[PDB]
Amino acid sequence: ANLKEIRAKVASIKSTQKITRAMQMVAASKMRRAQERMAQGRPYADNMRRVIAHLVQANPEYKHRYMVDRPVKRVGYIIVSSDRGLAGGLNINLFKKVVQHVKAQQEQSIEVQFALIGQKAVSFFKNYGGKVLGATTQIGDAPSLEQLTGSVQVMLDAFDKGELDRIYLVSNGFVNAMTQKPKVEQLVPLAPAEEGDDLNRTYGWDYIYEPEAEELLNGLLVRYIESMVYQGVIENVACEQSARMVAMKAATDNAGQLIKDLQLIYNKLRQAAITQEISEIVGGAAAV
Amino acid sequence: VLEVQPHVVTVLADTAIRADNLDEAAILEARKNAEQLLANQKSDLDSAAALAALAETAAQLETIRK
């Protein structure tokens, strides 16, 4: 209730509001950078999907196992989340959706395994428990694919033995600068759609490959999977910045409201103190 | 891999640099170190701003106004 306490509080809140506004501007600037990077490999994955469409077009008799579903079992969830806090509810919303969908398989009792990329993800998965076969941290704003090749490589190596059934990828979708959605998808099986390009006007002669097209797609397929997971993780990274701007702007507004209320209380206390001092002085001067 | 035709010439660049000759990655290594330094600096700023100031003012606000 001391006047100096209120003064210190208002000064501290002013400084904090200024630095939070500066951080909001910083986050706004960082927002676009990743948007641009996405637009860079977006054609890549787009032309890559055009490639994979050509890849599936090849070896018409041969069939790869990636296009079938074994008895649904051994579900594997890959989680990408922030390494730092203050991302709004994005982390908690994604994790809540993760655990709720985990009940799904848990409902028909499908064994659940998970891999993580985020630091908050590793903290949450350690607090919950279980055993994690792949954990990474400190990936970076623009991580090289090698930084993440190990997790997907070991996961695919594990699936190559047939132990796993399929991997259920998790990440966030950035709709606009103010709207994100925690999204869960499936990646291991692939089905072409609207890829009729080069099909209505395909060359009459058969595309004969000097290299063996029997295995040429294999590396491209693994190339396809690493490209898509890199695109997903970079999209999540870009979306992560989009939450911080609104978080800090809301924090600044709340700080403004609080400082207004504190100013009201401060004025009331100051007037009361002045009145009390004047009354005491007059009363004492009457005594003498 | 690569697809080449008079229409288009395309190459999947898993690992590749426009550096003139083989064994020229020193600049690439320098840029990687610079990016890591930027990551360290941004983590420093994030930790400082997000935790120190907010905890200082919240714990200050934790002390009741009146």
8 A C-beta contact, residue A266 and residue A6: yes
Are A130 and A178 part of one and the same domain? yes
**Final residue before a domain boundary, out of A173, A207, A241:** A207
Distance from CA of A140 to the nearest CA of B (A): 7
Q: Over the range A82-101, which residues count as b (16 or more CB within 10 Å of their CB) and which as e? A: bbbebbbebbeebbeebeeb
Using a CB–CB cutoff of 8 Å, tell me whether B53 touches chain A.
yes
Partner B contacted by A265 (CB < 8 A): yes
Strands A75-79 and A112-116: parallel
Are both A64 and A192 inside the same structural domain?
yes
| Counted domains in chain A | 2
Tell me, yes or no, whether A242 and A184 share the same domain.
no
Are residues A41 and A78 part of one domain?
A: no
Which of B64, B2, B41 lies closest to A209 in space, CA to CA?
Answer: B2
Exposure b/e, A23-41, CB count within 10 A at least 16 = b: bbebbbebbeebbebbeee
CA separation, residue B55 to residues A4, A176, A210, A234, B59 (Å): 20, 31, 65, 31, 6
Residues of chain B in contact with residue A144, where contact means CB-CB under 8 angstroms, are 32
**Residues ≥6 apart with Cβ < 8 Å to B7:** none
- Opening angle at CA A130, ends A125 and A133, nearest 5: 85
CB-CB contact of A170 with A75 (8 Å): no
Give me the residues of A, 34-63, that contact B with CB < 8 A.
Answer: 47, 51
Name the pairing type of β-strands B9-11 and A179-184.
Answer: unpaired
Question: d(Cα A193, Cα A52) in Å, to the nearest integer?
Answer: 12
By C-alpha distance, the chain B residue nearest A261 is: B65
Q: Which of B3, B57, B66 sits opposite A1 (nearest CB)?
A: B66
What's the reported resolution, in angstroms, to a tenth?
A: 3.2
With beta carbons less than 8 A apart as the criterion, state whether A177 and A240 touch: no
Nearest alpha-carbon partner for A170 in A71, A243, A102, A86? A102
Looking at the structure, do residues A234 and A284 belong to the same domain, yes or no? yes
* Determination technique used: cryo-EM
Structure tokens at B60: 């200050």
Helices (H), chain A: 3-57, 90-107, 119-128, 145-160, 213-287
Among A158, A178, A207, the domain-final residue is A207
List the single best residue of B44, B60, B62, B64 to mutate versus A (max A Cβ within 10 A).
Answer: B60
CA nearest B65 in A: which residue?
A1
Angle between helices A119-128 and A90-107 (to 10 degrees): 40
What domain range includes position A285?
1-59+208-288
A265 and A162 inside one domain: no
B27, B19 Cβ separation under 8 angstroms: yes
> Nearest 10 degrees: CA dihedral of A166, A172, A173, A178?
170
Give yes or no: residues A88 and A6 share one domain: no
The domain boundary residue, chosen from A180, A207, A234: A207
